[PDB]
Amino acid sequence: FPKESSWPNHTTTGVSASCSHNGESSFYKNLLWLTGKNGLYPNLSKSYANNKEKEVLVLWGVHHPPNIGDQRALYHKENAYVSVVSSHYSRKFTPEIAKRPKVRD
Amino acid sequence: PECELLISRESWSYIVEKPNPENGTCYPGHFADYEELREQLSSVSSFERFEI
Ligand SMILES: *[C@@H]1O[C@H](CO)[C@@H](O)[C@H](O)[C@H]1NC(C)=O
């Protein structure tokens, strides 16, 4: 995709303390910690077709906040599913957890 | 439906598959533990097709 011509309804300025570069907060370079936009989070159905080039590899992740408060105040609604689908890969993720220990602050 | 013309025998020593056969699962999907089933069904000494 493009960075700013494919997600116009989802802020992508993903900040995190643990992923600091030189004392300033940041995130990964190959991924994008979407956090909604304008106090909402529209249901996205973005796709891609590997008809061009060769056997490409695709990377993604799901974030499990450490409490219901982060879910409610960040994605603005609980019970959020992630369902990647392809010809031979159609499993779903339903991350809903309310506690964790502390690792790497 | 395309594979119902099989030779309905009773016992076999090893099954045979065409390399990448065309008419496999007519409905598209994922066969869970397919490889385990294939390894188990490789040999059978008595194969009585019942209906539960
Ligand atoms: C993003 O929001 C606008 C309205 O604000 C809407 O027209 C557009 O369809 C949305 N994006 C997608 C991919 O649906």
Side-chain angles (χ1 to χ4, degrees):
Chain A
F1 285 121
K3 220 196 167 181
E4 268 149 11
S5 176
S6 73
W7 286 290
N9 302 328
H10 284 130
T11 46
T12 66
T13 58
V15 296
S16 180
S18 161
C19 299
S20 85
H21 197 306
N22 283 318
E24 73 276 9
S25 172
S26 74
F27 196 63
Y28 278 100
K29 299 288 105 178
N30 298 336
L31 302 93
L32 209 48
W33 181 64
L34 274 73
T35 187
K37 198 148 184 216
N38 299 117
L40 281 75
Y41 195 111
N43 189 0
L44 62 94
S45 172
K46 282 301 169 179
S47 158
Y48 177 76
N50 189 17
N51 50 0
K52 34 202 181 299
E53 65 272 15
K54 313 153 297 298
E55 175 184 354
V56 303
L57 179 134
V58 176
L59 295 169
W60 80 101
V62 293
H63 173 245
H64 315 258
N67 52 4
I68 301 299
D70 289 20
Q71 281 282 107
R72 282 293 302 133
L74 194 151
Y75 302 115
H76 298 93
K77 62 92 175 179
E78 192 45 289
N79 54 55
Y81 68 96
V82 169
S83 48
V84 74
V85 296
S86 72
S87 74
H88 303 330
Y89 200 94
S90 172
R91 68 154 164 248
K92 180 195 277 191
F93 321 114
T94 179
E96 277 88 37
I97 303 93
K99 188 57 182 292
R100 281 303 202 308
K102 176 181 311 298
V103 166
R104 222 179 168 275
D105 213 357
Chain B
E2 304 298 334
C3 301
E4 187 44 78
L5 278 298
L6 73 165
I7 300 97
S8 190
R9 217 158 65 257
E10 201 66 36
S11 77
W12 60 82
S13 43
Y14 62 93
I15 76 175
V16 170
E17 212 187 343
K18 288 290 183 182
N20 201 2
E22 65 183 1
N23 277 90
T25 64
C26 64
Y27 209 87
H30 171 52
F31 206 110
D33 286 327
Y34 192 16
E35 281 295 325
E36 319 273 7
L37 179 87
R38 294 172 62 188
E39 183 64 23
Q40 288 178 184
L41 271 295
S42 76
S43 164
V44 163
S45 289
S46 77
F47 187 69
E48 292 83 3
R49 217 192 194 197
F50 286 178
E51 185 190 335
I52 65 163

